[PDB]
Design a protein around this ligand. Structure first.
Ligand SMILES: [Mg+2]
Ligand SMILES: [Mg+2]
Ligand SMILES: [Mg+2]
Ligand SMILES: [Mg+2]
Ligand SMILES: [Mg+2]
Ligand SMILES: [Mg+2]
Ligand SMILES: [Mg+2]
Ligand SMILES: [Mg+2]
Ligand SMILES: [Mg+2]
Ligand SMILES: [Mg+2]
Ligand SMILES: [Mg+2]
Ligand SMILES: [Mg+2]
Ligand SMILES: [Mg+2]
Ligand SMILES: [Mg+2]
Ligand SMILES: [Mg+2]
Ligand SMILES: [Mg+2]
Ligand SMILES: [Mg+2]
Ligand SMILES: [Mg+2]
Ligand SMILES: [Mg+2]
Ligand SMILES: [Mg+2]
Ligand SMILES: [Mg+2]
Ligand SMILES: [Mg+2]
Ligand SMILES: [Mg+2]
Lengths: 262, 143, 145, 206
RNA sequence: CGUCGCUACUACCGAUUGGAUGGUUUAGUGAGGCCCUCGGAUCGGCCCCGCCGGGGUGCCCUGGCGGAGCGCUG
RNA sequence: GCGUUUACUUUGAAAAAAUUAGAGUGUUCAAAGCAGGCCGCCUGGAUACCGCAGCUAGGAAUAAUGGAAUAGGACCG
RNA sequence: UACCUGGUUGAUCCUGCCAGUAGCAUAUGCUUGUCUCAAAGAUUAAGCCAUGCAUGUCUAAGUACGCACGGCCGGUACAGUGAAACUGCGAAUGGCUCAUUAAAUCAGUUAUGGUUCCUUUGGUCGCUCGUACUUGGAUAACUGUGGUAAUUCUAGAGCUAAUACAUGCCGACGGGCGCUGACCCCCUUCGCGGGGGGGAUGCGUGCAUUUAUCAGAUCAAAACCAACCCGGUCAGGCGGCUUUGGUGACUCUAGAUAACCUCGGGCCGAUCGCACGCCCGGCGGCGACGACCCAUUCGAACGUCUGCCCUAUCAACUUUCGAUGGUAGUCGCCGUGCCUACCAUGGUGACCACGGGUGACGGGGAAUCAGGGUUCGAUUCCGGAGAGGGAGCCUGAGAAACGGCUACCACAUCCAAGGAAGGCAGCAGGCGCGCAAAUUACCCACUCCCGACCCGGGGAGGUAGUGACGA
């Protein structure tokens, strides 16, 4: 080719959107932004297929143009704006502040929070760039460059930033004994404690994650997102809290579900 | 012995011209647990492609082989072996792949048929894309 | 693009050749010089009209401009008039008044945070000298082993 | 234009790479600069990514550093003597790198006559016909004379520069290329290269 | 089982430098574009000469006008 | 943060979707499709599989290859 | 479902073939009442093409004296609409086909510590030091005469705007640092002293960019003569002290000194619109924008490892025509024979090099199948190649682009015979070649894309018509 691509085919779209086959040919291109392509979720789906607040593509255009949605502190009007991991979608007209957390299966489900809680978010740091004639910066995983960080906070740590000032409050150093959120691979949406890390110079390191139910699996470190110290997490969680029931246990939760309700 | 060339050979990083009352020698490590040889620091050889005293890093893969030809200058030829596997017939077959490897002069006791361990780097020439990290001896025969 | 042109020397140049007059005419020829056709419009620009119509630094251009009475078919003619080119400063003050105060704000933001980082190291320096004077004071106790 | 591809030539073993595309624009090569020593003339050239490279067709002046006492100086150029690639890039003057230049550079008397408390040359017994170097040397003070006393006893130039402040030598050969960077900044050398180069200016002899 | 004898069939060798087509390919010329060296049509313009205005302190700049080094330079 | 090896075997990461194999659903059934079911409510949109090589991690039967015999022998001072 | 039957002989047991049998996908014949899905000029000719279409754009916010039109409170210049010019924005995506290409393309795999990246998100925006109450001059639309058989052909005169084209202030402001050192103070000895303390003056004072240098960012160790700033002062008498982060690995991000900085120029707002009050000329909030550099995003580009069809009636090849290496350079976004200049004579191969064919585009996959495997993958998804054939280049972040230009060869149009213009392997539709394959219809509503942007466009796409490929 000669320039960059712009369109997107329905089949080549990522799996965790759960788009059907018939309705069309193209899938909406995620705009250039902070998050990766295969790691985000557009507002036009979140407001047309997941929440179903509107049906047609022009009426999505007739929503965010009325200065309603204030993402993490500042209103964007791009109807296909890429919103990814750790974003506080805030609707002013009904107040239903949303947080986008991974389900127990490999997808993004709708998780509501309270407006009291919609004040901060937890960000994973990526690097420390020392700006000479001066001070070090930071680069988190959503590309939030910050000045004057700390002489303590290091490469793979997590911090608790604020919305309207873009400033830190607290932080957690990565030690074996914190929580863990597996962001990517065959364990996309699991939570457990950390028990071991292995060094592979030149190569990439790996980390064993123990589920609360004994199930000890493994995961390379670039999918790790520490959220809490000890056993205690710091935010609310979706329902399940990272069960990952077996495939035959879904028989039980699907059978005695109705039978225990009606 | 040294400087048989039309230009002047030197390491570029050091200033050798202050009020002189031997020059300090440049050398670095490599990582991955490889010791520098004794002959490098003490040695007066100079090169811009040696992985100890030049502007080249060491990255990627690490291989092995065996030395078989030394007629060229500052490069030697090794011979890798492996075994392909047909699954139709439940057997193997032999192959051999060869390559041209840049040789630092810090290694001296290298005869023919010596097990070597190479390392990937930036492309140095048309076909040399590897450096020699260590050279062993074959099955005895010291005499 | 390639085109086809003609030379710059008039040899056989039939087809009209446009005859401009850049010299004074002294006598009366009928078709040309009967009526001084005026300019279709006049100026706009502001230093060009300030200085052009008999005016100094400290006077006012809000009236010295071409009015152009029209003929409509059911109304009175109206003075169509322009407003361009850096009129002196009615409220363009207001944007410079803000531009020179955000420079006071970004300087305030780089003045509040420098000394604050100086205090945050000011805290961790009592420890930066404490840890050397505590651990090496215990290390001589370990060496006396 | 001229290419820098790999496909237009053979493999390692004598075969022929048959071509599978035409010449792409990112495989560009320009004609050479081949600069001279004249007036100042520099062309700007747009490059990949919207950036700019600066050529230099005709060049006169430089910026040469003395790597011992931490000084450098904008400096005039006249001559070309020894090139390490071509015997003919002296006969036709061209300024590229590791070409020793000997570039009269103001013959160490626009530079060396900057507050060094000494004369040199002037076949001995000879003086300066104006009295203006003797002014700098006959002005006394209290403790700044001691200041020149210390910046006088730890300072002796070598003999090879002691004999050569007539025309102005350089082992320099500006380490930046002028056809790509614009300007021309080199560096005077001392010791054990002056022997190698002047040995290459012993065997020249046509 | 074979020779000869009538009909029918496919390739083969072969004449005339038997023959031509099309594709891969050497030595001599070689439109056209791109860097270079100059070229200077041109529009100039200020200054450099000369006039009145005015303000200024006979001259200095400010607005029309007579002329010139091809002066400076884009 | 090394423990001087390959070959072989087991584990662990990593592996584009669709397709295929496969649960769920009563388009009036079916091939398809991913929806829909109760008086504002409740969900779903799973899993498995994925050779040949390279990286990790343990295994030492089999199959190759090594030391001291012109002793320049391997420790210990 | 790991399966068989007829046929040599006067009759029998055999090796062995022939014909049956069932799936599959192209054509064709005969017959054809109904209903849901649904292939379609790829196989010969990547051979040629009339007509009609297939890419443009404005918001409360750059410039509207477009009456083509139309506010009335005018008398201090502008209501909202609203062709053209520019500025930006795109036109480099999307579509269509498979002629080339056999370690090349590709899939998996790893590198950028060897480099560039419009826009988005976030940074930064006095750091650099000595007419501005916004400067200056031209060119569209328009008016007004035209030439030209003909074209999206264009001149001449007059106007006139800019987030275009170019100039160049004010500022915070006092200062310190490094140097040159007018000169300045003090002790002592008679001093020629070594012991000390003050300081005008001139330069200069980031970042980007180029050169050179310094240490850092070192680990456990001692016995002593010339020095003398601190503390023992007991009488020469014996102990000492100050410090950026990483990476497997830096000639990395760093800090400081001497200067260097292109007239075909480097940064420092000489921008507009909504509210909008505050104070004696003075003060906030919001935005649209625009540039420098650091991150980030979509990526792109060069390379690593391993992995392919037939042929020995192709067994030796390459190399002063760069073949394989060493040195210094040139170019280029960077690494290299990519290319010049100088030296050496080497590199692959029966473990199938080299050369030739292919009715070869590759991979995801499809049909039959016990297990093994054979054959097909032109064709809706990813990745590359190409627009009759071959070479060349502009603008631009990005193209050797062809619904963009410059020439050759082949094919080809209108002409007043002076000249002009072109490219369906884009959707439809004809000619042709064939055993061989559909409507010159309707519409932006769906899915989505472009722009200055809620609002205009899209033969991409969708819905219908033909349709016994088939289910
Ligand atoms: Mg492209
Ligand atoms: Mg097999
Ligand atoms: Mg894949
Ligand atoms: Mg054995
Ligand atoms: Mg029979
Ligand atoms: Mg029927
Ligand atoms: Mg068909
Ligand atoms: Mg294009
Ligand atoms: Mg083909
Ligand atoms: Mg081909
Ligand atoms: Mg072919
Ligand atoms: Mg392909
Ligand atoms: Mg079988
Ligand atoms: Mg078969
Ligand atoms: Mg593609
Ligand atoms: Mg071209
Ligand atoms: Mg091209
Ligand atoms: Mg076209
Ligand atoms: Mg054509
Ligand atoms: Mg085609
Ligand atoms: Mg549109
Ligand atoms: Mg289309
Ligand atoms: Mg039908």
């Amino acid at each position: 080719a000669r320039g960059p691509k712009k369109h997107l085919k329905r089949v080549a779209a990522p799996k965790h959107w759960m788009l059907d086959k018939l309705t069309g040919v193209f899938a909406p291109r995620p705009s250039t932004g902070p998050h990766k392509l295969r790691e985000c979720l557009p507002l036009i789906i979140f407001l047309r297929n997941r929440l179903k607040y509107a049906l047609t593509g022009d009426e999505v255009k007739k929503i965010c143009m009325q200065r309603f949605i204030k993402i993490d502190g500042k209103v964007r009007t791009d109807i296909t704006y890429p919103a990814g991991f750790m974003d506080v979608i805030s609707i002013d007209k009904t107040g239903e502040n949303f947080r986008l957390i991974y389900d127990t299966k490999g997808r993004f489900a709708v998780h509501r929070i309270t407006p009291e809680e919609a004040k901060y978010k937890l960000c994973k740091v990526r690097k420390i760039f020392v700006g000479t004639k001066g001070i070090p910066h930071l680069v988190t995983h959503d590309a939030r460059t910050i000045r004057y960080p700390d002489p303590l906070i290091k490469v793979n740590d997590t911090i608790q930033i604020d919305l309207e000032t873009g400033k830190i409050t607290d932080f957690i150093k990565f030690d074996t004994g914190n929580l863990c959120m597996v962001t990517g691979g065959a364990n996309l949406g699991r939570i457990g404690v950390i028990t071991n890390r292995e060094r592979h110079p030149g190569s990439f390191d790996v980390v064993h994650v123990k589920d609360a139910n004994g199930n000890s699996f493994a995961t390379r470190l670039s999918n790790i997102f520490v959220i809490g110290k000890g056993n205690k997490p710091w935010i609310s969680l979706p329902r399940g809290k990272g069960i990952r029931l077996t495939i035959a246990e879904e028989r039980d939760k699907r059978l005695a579900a109705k039978q225990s309700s009606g | 012995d040294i400087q048989t060339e039309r230009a002047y050979q030197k390491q570029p990083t050091i200033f050798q011209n202050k009020k002189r009352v031997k020059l300090p020698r440049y050398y670095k490590n490599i990582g991955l647990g490889f010791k520098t040889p004794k002959e490098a620091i003490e040695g007066t050889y100079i090169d811009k492609k040696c992985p100890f005293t030049g502007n080249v890093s060491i990255r990627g893969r690490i291989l092995s082989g065996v030395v078989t030809k030394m007629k060229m200058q500052r490069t030697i030829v090794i011979r890798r072996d492996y075994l392909h596997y047909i699954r139709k017939y439940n057997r193997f077959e032999k192959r051999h792949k060869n390559m041209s490897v840049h040789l630092s002069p810090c290694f001296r006791d290298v005869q023919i048929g010596d097990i070597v361990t190479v390392g990937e780097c930036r492309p140095l020439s048309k076909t040399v894309r590897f450096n020699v990290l260590k050279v062993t001896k074959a099955a005895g025969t010291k005499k | 693009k390639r085109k086809s042109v003609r030379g710059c020397i008039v040899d056989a140049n039939l087809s009209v050749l446009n005859l401009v007059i850049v010299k004074k005419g002294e006598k009366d020829i009928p078709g040309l010089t009967d009526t001084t056709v005026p300019r279709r419009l006049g100026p706009k620009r502001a230093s060009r009209i300030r200085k052009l119509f008999n005016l100094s630094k400290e006077d006012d251009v809000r009236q010295y401009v071409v009015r152009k009475p029209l003929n409509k078919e059911g109304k009175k003619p109206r003075t169509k008039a322009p407003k361009i080119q850096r009129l002196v400063t009615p409220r363009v003050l207001q944007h410079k008044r803000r531009r020179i105060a955000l420079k006071k704000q970004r300087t305030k933001k780089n003045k509040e945070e420098a000394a604050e980082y100086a205090k945050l190291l000011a805290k961790r320096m009592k420890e930066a000298k404490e840890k050397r004077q505590e651990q090496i004071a215990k290390r001589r106790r370990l060496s006396s082993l | 234009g001229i290419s820098r591809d790999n496909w237009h030539k053979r493999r390692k073993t004598g075969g022929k790479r048959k071509p599978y595309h035409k010449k792409r624009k990112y495989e560009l090569g320009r004609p050479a600069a081949n600069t001279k020593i004249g007036p100042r003339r520099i062309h700007t050239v747009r490059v990949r990514g919207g950036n700019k490279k600066y050529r230099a067709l005709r060049l006169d002046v430089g910026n040469f550093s003395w790597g011992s006492e931490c000084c450098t100086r904008k400096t005039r150029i006249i001559d070309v003597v020894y090139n390490a690639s071509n015997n003919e890039l002296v006969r036709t003057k061209t300024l590229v790198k590791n070409c020793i230049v000997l570039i009269d550079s103001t013959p160490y008397r626009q530079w060396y006559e900057s507050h060094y408390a000494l004369p040199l040359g002037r076949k001995k017994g000879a003086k300066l016909t104006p009295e203006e170097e003797e002014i700098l040397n006959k002005k006394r003070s209290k403790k700044i004379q001691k200041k020149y006393d210390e910046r006088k006893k730890n300072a002796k130039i070598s003999s090879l520069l002691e004999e050569q402040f007539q025309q102005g030598k350089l082992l320099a050969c500006i380490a930046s290329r002028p056809g790509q960077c614009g300007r021309a900044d080199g560096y005077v050398l001392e010791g054990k290269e002056l022997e190698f180069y002047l040995r290459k200016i012993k065997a020249r002899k046509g």
